Amino acid sequence: MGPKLFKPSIDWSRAFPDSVYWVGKAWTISAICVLAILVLLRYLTPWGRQFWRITRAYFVGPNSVRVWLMLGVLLLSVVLAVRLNVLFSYQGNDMYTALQKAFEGIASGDGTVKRSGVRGFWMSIGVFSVMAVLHVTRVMADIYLTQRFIIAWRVWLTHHLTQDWLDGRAYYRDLFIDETIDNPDQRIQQDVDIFTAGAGGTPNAPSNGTASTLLFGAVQSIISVISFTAILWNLSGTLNIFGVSIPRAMFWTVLVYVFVATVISFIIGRPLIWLSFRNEKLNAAFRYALVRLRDAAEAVGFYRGERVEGTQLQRRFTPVIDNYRRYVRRSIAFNGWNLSVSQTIVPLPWVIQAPRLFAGQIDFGDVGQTATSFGNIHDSLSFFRNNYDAFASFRAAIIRLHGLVDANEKGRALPAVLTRPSDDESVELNDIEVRTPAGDRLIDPLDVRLDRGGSLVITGRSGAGKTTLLRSLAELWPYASGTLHRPGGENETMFLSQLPYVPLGTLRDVVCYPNSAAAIPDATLRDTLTKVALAPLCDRLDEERDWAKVLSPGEQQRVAFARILLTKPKAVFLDGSTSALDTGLEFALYQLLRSELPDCIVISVSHRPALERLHENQLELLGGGQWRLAPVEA
Amino acid sequence: MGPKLFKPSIDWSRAFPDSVYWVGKAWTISAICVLAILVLLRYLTPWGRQFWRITRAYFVGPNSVRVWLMLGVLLLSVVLAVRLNVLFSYQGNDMYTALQKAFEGIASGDGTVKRSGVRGFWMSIGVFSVMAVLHVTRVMADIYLTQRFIIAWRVWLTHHLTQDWLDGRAYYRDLFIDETIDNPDQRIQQDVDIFTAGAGGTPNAPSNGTASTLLFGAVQSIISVISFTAILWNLSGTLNIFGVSIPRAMFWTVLVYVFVATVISFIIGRPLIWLSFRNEKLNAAFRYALVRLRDAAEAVGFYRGERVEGTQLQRRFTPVIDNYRRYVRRSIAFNGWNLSVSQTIVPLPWVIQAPRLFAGQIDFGDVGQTATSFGNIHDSLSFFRNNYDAFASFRAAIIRLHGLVDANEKGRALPAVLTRPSDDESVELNDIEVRTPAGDRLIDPLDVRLDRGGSLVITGRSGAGKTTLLRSLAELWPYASGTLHRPGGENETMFLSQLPYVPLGTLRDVVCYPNSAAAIPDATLRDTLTKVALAPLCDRLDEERDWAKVLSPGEQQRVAFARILLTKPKAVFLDGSTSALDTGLEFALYQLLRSELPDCIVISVSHRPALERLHENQLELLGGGQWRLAPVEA
Ligand SMILES: CCCCCCCCCCCCO[C@@H]1O[C@H](CO)[C@@H](O[C@H]2O[C@H](CO)[C@@H](O)[C@H](O)[C@H]2O)[C@H](O)[C@H]1O
Ligand SMILES: CCCCCCCCCCCCO[C@@H]1O[C@H](CO)[C@@H](O[C@H]2O[C@H](CO)[C@@H](O)[C@H](O)[C@H]2O)[C@H](O)[C@H]1O
Ligand SMILES: CCCCCCCCCCCCO[C@@H]1O[C@H](CO)[C@@H](O[C@H]2O[C@H](CO)[C@@H](O)[C@H](O)[C@H]2O)[C@H](O)[C@H]1O
Ligand SMILES: CCCCCCCCCCCCO[C@@H]1O[C@H](CO)[C@@H](O[C@H]2O[C@H](CO)[C@@H](O)[C@H](O)[C@H]2O)[C@H](O)[C@H]1O
Ligand SMILES: CCCCCCCCCCCCO[C@@H]1O[C@H](CO)[C@@H](O[C@H]2O[C@H](CO)[C@@H](O)[C@H](O)[C@H]2O)[C@H](O)[C@H]1O
Ligand SMILES: CCCCCCCCCCCCO[C@@H]1O[C@H](CO)[C@@H](O[C@H]2O[C@H](CO)[C@@H](O)[C@H](O)[C@H]2O)[C@H](O)[C@H]1O
Ligand SMILES: CCCCCCCCCCCCO[C@@H]1O[C@H](CO)[C@@H](O[C@H]2O[C@H](CO)[C@@H](O)[C@H](O)[C@H]2O)[C@H](O)[C@H]1O
């Protein structure tokens, strides 16, 4: 080995025109190699067929051009990060060689090699100072670009998923299907945030880049393997251990040590899916037991039952803390193997290359590159076993959403009562039988016809099929049969409930509930509030406090007689609606209904024997199935 | 510089008997230095006086010995981690010297220095193989020891905080205080998990050790500074830049560069507290609007109002996504400074020591130790500015709990009605005036006395002070005055509500609600269910489904007449309770009450004019303030 000076590894001049063609070449290969694996994952996979049923309409259509145009920049922002990782490795090959040429000039004595080794050190520091700004600039323009995507995804998904909950009265007929969902108030608010925001377990924090995401963190660990496998191939040598001549030992060793140590870490973390799904189910049945106590806080204070409610509230907190203690005991046997494997491989490229260095074969430059390339194809093939604890919690957020999407298509396939429009203006019903979900009987087939000015009173016992007749004519009860003829329209058939109801907003929205607040003028709302003796509420039409705990139940049944004078229906049904009003105010509220609307089919359910002298006919339920119709004898 | 062989830095023999005395010496200093800073933080701090009001009783008392004994091991588990970080730095000082003595024997020619440098390399690999098992063993016995602490803290805190919510009827009188809390169903379930589990922002995951916690991550960054400052002190030299002779440049430089760059990163992240407090408030008023729609899903289906409810549900989702977009825009200007500062300091110990190395002053061993000690007192003084985004979200979880603890001591200071026990058996009330929170009047002072067999009917209009008389005798209405004399006891004065109520559990718990299910024998519950005509419910006493949506409101008022035959009260009040029952079943339910309990003061509120011929006296509210008392006629 004669006197050789210092020569660089890569020509640092013409390094920017060469790293502008490699990026443009590696982008178009990966753009058609990524789009051929997701097609193979939409089929042939049980968890890939449930990802596409939820969010299909966001990626296809005419309004899905700005989605792919923003998804195509995040691949350039990963290829540009692999290229800098290679150019950082090319510089430590120069610095450790320049630090070796300076030591062989001091001990030898000459000053030609030393002056060529000193000048090679101050060159390989100025290259580090230019490639340290392009790292900060690339990192900080990558947090901002990936937080504008998982916001606009979440805003679309939680708006599309709610129209699917209240489309065909599917929020009420989900109690009769065979397999029922637990609570759909949590899978819309919280679970969409875990589903859309990349890494599983937690909702997103405003510092999550693209390296903490289970898609773009996996397509980096393939380009980082393909781009590094041409450096480790021509830096290893023949190894003899048992008389077997292995040609490239350090390259075939790392592909055996990972494949064996991976398949043991898939049978340890196998039951880790059904322990992270039960942690969201038992934690969302504890919060519902506290909200139900909040809006019923007067009846608990009346009964003084604050000690029985301290037991049915503690019976739901025991299995949410007994399940967590075995979720902890499984994530130590899983995290104790992936660290004990990765720790006993770090002195391996220092004990194979070290006998080849003390003899004159290599020159201390390629030891500092073998120590980097071996610790970078090992940190990229160990992505599929280091991040299995954050994928098994992401697979338990597709099941919860797929249950909600599945249990609304079986909520619109249950049978109901067929409804047809009338001939001119009539309410006639041909044959109706109503059953009980256990299989009993309530009402035999009956035939009723009303005319344009008729009336009807339905009377009977206290617990025999009286409200569930009206729950069948409103298309809400599945166990029924028959047909109905109605004066159909938009709001030309009004129903009223037995227990009163008030919405959330201001009092102007409480007064006219089925219509909007802007479709009713201001000048007509202050006169109809004085016919129902609701005088002192002419102010306070712009307040915000909750009216379910302020308005007494004798004033929530006079508001319900003001929603019937503004909508102007034709065939209004009503049950109850005089449970709190006394006689004198009850008789004064039906004369107004007969004097304002001159021709409406009024059907009213009642209990007190002072309303039968106002209507014309009468239907009586004997209980057990038998009905009896008779005209008002008067 | 003559021929010198290889000598180690530290005597590796007698390294275990020396590192067993240093740990025992550094434990007792830190045990009394840590306990003198927390005392200075309990006072003199606005966020330290609110931490002690919540969780005081857990750390003091006689049952708080096993808390400190488990808190004292987690300090040993940090001192044992600083000592290994020093012993790892002592080994790179040997390996880089042994790699330098081998290169000065090849170029010089002799084989005495080379054979002494080769043998010094294979010694400093076997020391790395022993100190790599004590790292994995220490890390994996540190996850398990800190997950047994923040479980037993959470189980105690969420049980102590709930007894403070329903102690003195404080769940109802929190609506009348001056500054009201938002929703206390979220600060008990979720916010205790963020408060107890160390690092802020997210609830704990089962892999959080002790280095991801805002207390034991701060007491490591002081012992790591004190233990490393004696190595960097005697490795730096005199630097001349502008004619000023600085004695120790590399030590006084790093204490100036951090103190300046810290105080700029405290005025950028200053409004980051009130943006992480509003993210939990606007996200917990959206979920409440979905639960209220779930248990009232019949009245929305009757009215067909699924389009007005799609607007009052979208008016609460706009400000939860408009606030997040400015939480993202602040966490980039804060994270863009702490990375741009820490990146431009990494080539600094390589450009000051490099002219001193090419001349014969140092020997390449202490460059590899200056590169480590400078990058370890810089990574420990930068703990108070790198982790300010996770502390400003922890300071917004003490305000939410302190509001809940504060708003229950002002909920028991409001005035009420004084109650005294009776003389023998009587209900007499002296003077009672009842007001309205706006300042109006409902009831003038009145004086009523009942005897051991008397009765009373309270009648009046539909909206004039009828239920709020009974909301004052039950100690629930703050705007009242006067006194009351009652036959006091445990359950010798029963109240009933206007709207019925059913608890959560099985039907055996629904039937006997104020008593427990075990305090009533089985043989007496099946006879009293047949006197109230509730015959077919003799089975299904062991089911689980919700009975608020199954039992009709005509059968939730006959169950309420079976809670009055098992408790056996003396002076029972009741309002409503016959809104759905017809005549014939109403008259048959009062004869049973008079025939089973032979002497009870029965006070009943009613509307229908067929109940006044059963009682004896009568009180009538004229409306506006005037009352009128008269004995029952014929
Ligand atoms: C599209 C983005 C591309 C991503 C990858 C980024 C590639 C660019 C990063 C490395 C740039 C290296 O920048 C380097 O600077 C040093 C000076 O400090 C210069 O280095 C060169 O200087 C002069 C030419 O000017 C030569 O005679 C000399 O032999 C050589 O040392 C070159 O200008 C360039 O080789
Ligand atoms: C940063 C967070 C992570 C981001 C997550 C990004 C996920 C992107 C996944 C897209 C993968 C492509 O998904 C693939 O799209 C093509 C269209 O090009 C579909 O091809 C076709 O699908 C069905 C097949 O019946 C057709 O009805 C549809 O018209 C058509 O799109 C494939 O069915 C789908 O599997
Ligand atoms: C992570 C993968 C990154 C590689 C992909 C980057 C794309 C770079 C160019 C962006 C242009 C995207 O533009 C988009 O292309 C896809 C083809 O896939 C077209 O096709 C897409 O929509 C059409 C309907 O419009 C569907 O029938 C089809 O199933 C769907 O794949 C879109 O109509 C077009 O809007
Ligand atoms: C999810 C799967 C995604 C698949 C991703 C596939 C990425 C492909 C890696 C880049 C391939 C580029 O192919 C390469 O191009 C450059 C420019 O000529 C040349 O090779 C260049 O990159 C390779 C890295 O592979 C270097 O080892 C080599 O020093 C360099 O000159 C060769 O011609 C060819 O090996
Ligand atoms: C429609 C396209 C859907 C793409 C949505 C985005 C997902 C991005 C890819 C997920 C990354 C997971 O990374 C790795 O994936 C492979 C499968 O490829 C999983 O490997 C396994 O997954 C599960 C869990 O055992 C097995 O049922 C499956 O048979 C096997 O493929 C690894 O457990 C996971 O660590
Ligand atoms: C309480 C826990 C303490 C925490 C800190 C941990 C301290 C222990 C870690 C370092 C232990 C070093 O272990 C080291 O092993 C090498 C062999 O490989 C030995 O090293 C020594 O060997 C023999 C003595 O046996 C000597 O003549 C020789 O000069 C020297 O190289 C010593 O046995 C010990 O110095
Ligand atoms: C891993 C998660 C993080 C773990 C968090 C650990 C926090 C531990 C904090 C404890 C600090 C000591 O806190 C200090 O205790 C001493 C008792 O020794 C108290 O000293 C005294 O406090 C008040 C003073 O009026 C007395 O009523 C009380 O009897 C007494 O304890 C101090 O008031 C308190 O400030």
Ligand SMILES: CCCCCCCCCCCCO[C@@H]1O[C@H](CO)[C@@H](O[C@H]2O[C@H](CO)[C@@H](O)[C@H](O)[C@H]2O)[C@H](O)[C@H]1O
């Ligand atoms: C993070 C700090 C770690 C350093 C502390 C490690 C302690 C090592 C020995 C553990 C013994 C602890 O034992 C505990 O000591 C404290 C003194 O602080 C005593 O004092 C504690 O409780 C008593 C009442 O019992 C209170 O009046 C007092 O305010 C409180 O500090 C406890 O009564 C005792 O149970």
Ligand SMILES: CCCCCCCCCCCCO[C@@H]1O[C@H](CO)[C@@H](O[C@H]2O[C@H](CO)[C@@H](O)[C@H](O)[C@H]2O)[C@H](O)[C@H]1O
């Ligand atoms: C929240 C605040 C907590 C404060 C924590 C305070 C920790 C104190 C650090 C350890 C102090 C030990 O004090 C030290 O003891 C050992 C054993 O003799 C000796 O010094 C030993 O440790 C020091 C580290 O400081 C080394 O630089 C030295 O090589 C070693 O011999 C000296 O005598 C004395 O400097």
Ligand SMILES: CCCCCCCCCCCCO[C@@H]1O[C@H](CO)[C@@H](O[C@H]2O[C@H](CO)[C@@H](O)[C@H](O)[C@H]2O)[C@H](O)[C@H]1O
């Ligand atoms: C009763 C004992 C309470 C101990 C509970 C456990 C808390 C553990 C210590 C908190 C760690 C925070 O670490 C660092 O603390 C210092 C104060 O010491 C904070 O410094 C500042 O805090 C806030 C925020 O500006 C200022 O109002 C305060 O004036 C100042 O001290 C830093 O913002 C924080 O990064």
Ligand SMILES: Nc1ncnc2c1ncn2[C@@H]1O[C@H](COP(=O)(O)OP(=O)(O)NP(=O)(O)O)[C@@H](O)[C@H]1O
């Ligand atoms: N915060 C409030 N809580 C209760 N009532 C309030 C409140 N603010 C104002 N009020 C009025 O106070 C009165 C109390 O009504 P209340 O005496 O309970 O009715 P009632 O006579 O029991 N009704 P009814 O059941 O129909 O016979 C009503 O006029 C309310 O509108």
Ligand SMILES: Nc1ncnc2c1ncn2[C@@H]1O[C@H](COP(=O)(O)OP(=O)(O)NP(=O)(O)O)[C@@H](O)[C@H]1O
């Ligand atoms: N899932 C169910 N939903 C409704 N009713 C059910 C259900 N399962 C059983 N039933 C019984 O079916 C009957 C329906 O009661 P319903 O006809 O609504 O009462 P009502 O006659 O309106 N009562 P009332 O208001 O006092 O006059 C009752 O006997 C219920 O106990």
Ligand SMILES: [Mg+2]
């Ligand atoms: Mg009914």
Ligand SMILES: [Mg+2]
């Ligand atoms: Mg009332």
